[PDB]
Amino acid sequence: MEMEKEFEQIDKSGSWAAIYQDIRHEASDFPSRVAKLPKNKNRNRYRDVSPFDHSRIKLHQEDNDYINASLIKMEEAQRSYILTQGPLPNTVGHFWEMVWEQKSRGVVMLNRVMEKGSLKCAQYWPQKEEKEMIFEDTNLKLTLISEDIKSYYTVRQLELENLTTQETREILHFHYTTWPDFGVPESPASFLNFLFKVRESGSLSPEHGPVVVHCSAGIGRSGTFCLADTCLLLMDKRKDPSSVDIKKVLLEMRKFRMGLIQTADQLRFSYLAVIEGAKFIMGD
Numbered sequence: 001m002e003m004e005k006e007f008e009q010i011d012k013s014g015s016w017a018a019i020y021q022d023i024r025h026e027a028s029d030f031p032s033r034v035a036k037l038p039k040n041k042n043r044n045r046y047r048d049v050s051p052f053d054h055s056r057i058k059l060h061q062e063d064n065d066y067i068n069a070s071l072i073k074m075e076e077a078q079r080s081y082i083l084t085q086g087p088l089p090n091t092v093g094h095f096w097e098m099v100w101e102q103k104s105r106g107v108v109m110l111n112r113v114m115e116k117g118s119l120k121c122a123q124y125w126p127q128k129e130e131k132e133m134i135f136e137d138t139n140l141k142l143t144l145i146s147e148d149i150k151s152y153y154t155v156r157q158l159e160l161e162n163l164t165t166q167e168t169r170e171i172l173h174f175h176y177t178t179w180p181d182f183g184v185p186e187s188p189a190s191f192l193n194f195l196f197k198v199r200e201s202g203s204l205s206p207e208h209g210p211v212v213v214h215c216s217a218g219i220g221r222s223g224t225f226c227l228a229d230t231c232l233l234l235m236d237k238r239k240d241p242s243s244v245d246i247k248k249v250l251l252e253m254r255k256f257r258m259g260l261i262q263t264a265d266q267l268r269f270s271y272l273a274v275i276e277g278a279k280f281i282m283g284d
């Protein structure tokens, strides 16, 4: 069923809350035993948001390999994403270790450091060129190279140095700065513009490790970004673009990380973004 007609049918019937609960009911449940070990309590931002054991990213160290991060591998679309929480004061070094070890080119940040008067994630990147950051626990140096501030987002060029080998890499930081404190954006135009800027950078392409995507918990806004990207790519690839079923793509993604798309409004916004984005994919 053409999702644009499914959309008008759910809207006219006001059944978004009902569709959403149906997804919550059918979603996978896998063990998260490593996340719940007592040694890892200060590595988790939220007690109810944990990576599954089968899909968790492992840090390359014998001490403690744990980070709150999941590999979402989309087989038909040929795209992979790492979804993670906003870094905590004691996990900023783990965060950059993961970027280094997974060979990522891009970090996508969908939250502000402060929202609703509370801290949603650590200040994990340098704000001035001449004030670099050293992560002594993981032996990394991070330097701000350049910053481009636009109305709806900021792009930063960062240099990450492995102090052990003196290898360096360029990381691109894509920071969506205008998601509202409550609810979802009224139009998806600025979110799609942002998604197309990440794609244009090479950050989502198979010559690099998976893109790292986060918000505060790494399930809600983060879920919306990867769901929209994957659905538009499948509409490009398939003989019949009207066969793309957004609810079925979301359940596939929930096999790899719990809780993706946190509200019925985020579900409705994901539909709007895919429907408006398809008017480019189909030749405009």
Ligand SMILES: O=C(O)c1cccc(-c2ccco2)c1
Binding pocket: 145, 157, 158, 159, 170
């Ligand atoms: O990434 C870096 O370490 C670096 C160092 C010097 C110059 C530039 C640069 C990028 C685009 C034009 O010049 C980048």
